[PDB]
Structure formats: structure tokens, C-alpha cells
Amino acid sequence: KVFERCELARTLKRLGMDGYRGISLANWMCLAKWESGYNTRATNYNAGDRSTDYGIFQINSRYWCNDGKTPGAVNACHLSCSALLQDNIADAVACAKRVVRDPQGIRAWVAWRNRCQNRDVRQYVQGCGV
Ligand SMILES: [Cl-]
Ligand SMILES: [Cl-]
Ligand SMILES: [Cl-]
Numbered sequence: 001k002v003f004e005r006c007e008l009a010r011t012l013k014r015l016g017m018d019g020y021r022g023i024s025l026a027n028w029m030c031l032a033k034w035e036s037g038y039n040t041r042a043t044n045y046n047a048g049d050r051s052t053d054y055g056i057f058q059i060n061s062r063y064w065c066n067d068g069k070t071p072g073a074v075n076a077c078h079l080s081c082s083a084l085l086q087d088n089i090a091d092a093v094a095c096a097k098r099v100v101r102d103p104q105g106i107r108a109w110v111a112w113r114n115r116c117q118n119r120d121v122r123q124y125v126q127g128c129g130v
Helices: 005-014 025-036 081-085 090-099 110-115
Strands: 043-046 051-054
Touching: 005 025, 025 110, 051 081, 081 090
Parallel strands: none
Antiparallel strands: 043 051
């Protein structure tokens, strides 16, 4: 599914993302926006290293979820990458929380550094009731 902006904001807030390990909701929104356009079913193959990115946060198979087909990979979220292609984003959120328990936090995603870091991200949550 492709979430509408404010629907997603409220969905993430219910799942406990607001301020998780210091990360505001508007940061998570900015991440989802630029990773996937708020689209849960997106996959992107990285020909360079044979990994794939999955779902609304484009979480990578080398470190985070198992797809069977990524050489040398691990699965720190202990999920099938299939779980990151559901319309229900609970598993994706749990996995995103796992990512940001590591030292880099939200910097783990380059798109966040590119499109969100050091910017005014207030617009992502404007009017959403969060
Ligand atoms: Cl901030
Ligand atoms: Cl699973
Ligand atoms: Cl689903």
C-alpha cells in the first residue's frame, strides 16, 4: 500500500516511533518519504553488492532481514524480508527500531543524510494531529 502522509504519521505514532532513540516523527516521515514514497511493497535490487532494499523504509537484506539470496548476509531483525512488504507496517517499524539501536542511529540510511539531516522537516507532520 501507498500511505497518505498524515495517515502514516498517525500510524507511526501509534507504533511508538515518536522520539524513539531520540528520533522525532518528522524524521521518520522524511525517511519514509525519500526511501519509498510511503510505499510498503517497494523493492530495489542493488546490483553492486547483490543485496535488496525492502518496503517503506527500504531496509537492506545484507544486515537486517533474510532473503536467502544475499551473500554473507545476516538478519538482525530476525525476519524474512517478506515481512517488510506487508501493508501492515508493525514488523517494518520493529526492524527500523532495531536499526537505530545501533551506533549510527538514523544515519544508517544515506537518504536520510541527503534529504533530511540538518533540514527543516516540520512539513512532513503538519496538520496530521501528531
Ligand atoms: Cl530533529
Ligand atoms: Cl517473517
Ligand atoms: Cl498486510
